[PDB]
Design a protein around this ligand. Sequence first.
Ligand SMILES: Nc1ncnc2c1ncn2[C@@H]1O[C@H](COP(=O)(O)O)[C@@H](O)[C@H]1O
Ligand SMILES: [Mg+2]
Ligand SMILES: [Mg+2]
Length: 200
Amino acid sequence: ADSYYDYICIIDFEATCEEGNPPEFVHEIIEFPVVLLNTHTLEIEDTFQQYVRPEINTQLSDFCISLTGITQDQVDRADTFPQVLKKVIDWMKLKELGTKYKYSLLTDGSWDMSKFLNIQCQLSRLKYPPFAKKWINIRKSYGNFYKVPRSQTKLTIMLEKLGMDYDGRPHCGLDDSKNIARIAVRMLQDGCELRINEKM
Ligand SMILES: Nc1ncnc2c1ncn2[C@@H]1O[C@H](COP(=O)(O)O)[C@@H](O)[C@H]1O
Ligand SMILES: [Mg+2]
Ligand SMILES: [Mg+2]
């Protein structure tokens, strides 16, 4: 398996939303998961998961709660986005990412990590983190490696094509991140050289 990176960090956010995806509703991140994939052992070595308390639209819609399974009380008890991002940065530093170990972020598309983070950093008046400015977009990697159209790189289809079931609850951010990590593991086992393929 490709050992170009020592670790791959999979991040797939959940955000506030309304039914019908209205463009005037401003998204806030409500779940910040990180799955740490060891490229040498091909094991998920560790995970990070925190909910995040939205401030612009504090009350989750019924649609959002139904979609993600995240409840109002779970976000009520959560820390602010700046506090959660601080914890993520600490955790990554603890894992020695970017110092002892070479690493990349891996995502399920541009929206699913970068655009939500971009919106949220605007809202929180934070710099968009340089470490998140490039990533492996696994839909692009999968499409190019298995030679399938974009229509066939939906998360459930990627799993099904490879003889895998979805493990856990779809639209739980940590569970989606884990399933994306499972696909990445199989791609590495299959001989794919996963590489950064998208920049902001
Ligand atoms: N069907 C949908 N309708 C409205 N928003 C959605 C829908 N699917 C996903 N989203 C939004 O996009 C986020 C990430 O999607 P996902 O990674 O599939 O859970 C969700 O947390 C929602 O904010
Ligand atoms: Mg996603
Ligand atoms: Mg998700």
